[PDB]
Nucleic acid binder design. Structure first.
Lengths: 103, 85
DNA sequence: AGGCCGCTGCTGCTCAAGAGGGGTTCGCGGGACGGCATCGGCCAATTGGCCCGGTGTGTCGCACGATCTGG
DNA sequence: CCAGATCGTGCGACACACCGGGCCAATTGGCCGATGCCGTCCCGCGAACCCCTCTACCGTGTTGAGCAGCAGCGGCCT
């Protein structure tokens, strides 16, 4: 039989090569974890990353990251109740339930 | 995708034999060929980069490279390199 | 009648079904932009021709002439 | 005996040996400068590509052998 893992290789070595320049950017975690990351000089620095210690969101040493609201927390039972029913129906069922409870 | 030792040794021999053929060429010819194809470093530099070292014009770098290819692509130095292709 | 000391049996582990709505990919084209690639000239530059002008030194083509071996 | 091969010697030719002159042929090879087609990229639209959402007659159950530990029980002991 013949088989191949989807992996590519090159006839090439580490000796006798000059490495391109890189810059170390520092990131900090909420709990105090700090780490360094090497990036190419001809690169853009993203504002947010994941931590190398506890796998939580982390920002740069200098903070310039605001919050943009995401639109998909809506799903609850309350908003569906608003969508399905008007306020008067909820008020009258509420009044009936209080009446029977205090009865 | 397993490194076959025969293929690795063949490639190493090809790499060692390629430099010798460039050795018999003049200094400028071997230098410009190596820089253009990045044999020594792996980064193929532009014609202006090559001409900066020697100070010759871009067009000069264009011509000097062509003569080297004509020399190597001749029935006088091809035999040493025919097998590896 | 509970605690406890043994027996004895049992078990377990191991070796040989649609429909709608929406953001994103990519895939064709589609052309615009900038760039490098290809073709008449062109003259006065190193090597190498291509010789004049002298002899000499030394090979070769042949004349006079002596010695020697064979005929 | 003596005459040509071999060699001595001589005269000439002479194929260049020199080391120096004085111009030239061929043959350039660069890209000079001018002209032209292809690679890259930036949209432009559209086909598909993947994800999420909702539908209300109703309907209510998947072998042998060897060795060791634990549960039940007979029977003292208090």
């Amino acid at each position: 039989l013949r088989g191949t893992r989807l992996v590519v290789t090159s006839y090439e070595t580490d000796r006798g090569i000059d490495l391109a320049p890189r810059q170390a950017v520092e990131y900090a975690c909420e709990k105090g974890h700090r780490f360094e990351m090497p990036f190419s000089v001809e690169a853009e620095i993203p504002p947010e990353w994941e931590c190398k210690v506890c796998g939580i969101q982390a920002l740069l040493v200098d903070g310039d990251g605001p919050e943009e609201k995401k639109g998909k927390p809506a799903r609850t039972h309350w908003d569906m109740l608003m969508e399905r029913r008007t306020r008067e129906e909820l008020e009258e069922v509420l009044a009936e339930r209080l009446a029977v409870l205090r009865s | 995708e397993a490194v076959v030792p025969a293929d690795a040794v063949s490639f190493t021999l090809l790499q060692e034999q390629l430099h010798s053929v460039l050795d018999t060429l003049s200094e400028r010819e071997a230098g410009v060929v190596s820089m253009r194809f990045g044999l020594t470093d792996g980064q193929p530099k532009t014609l202006d980069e090559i001409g900066k070292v020697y100070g010759v014009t871009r067009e000069r770098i264009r011509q000097i490279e062509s003569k080297t290819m004509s020399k190597l692509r001749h029935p006088s130095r091809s035999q040493v390199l025919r097998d590896y292709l």
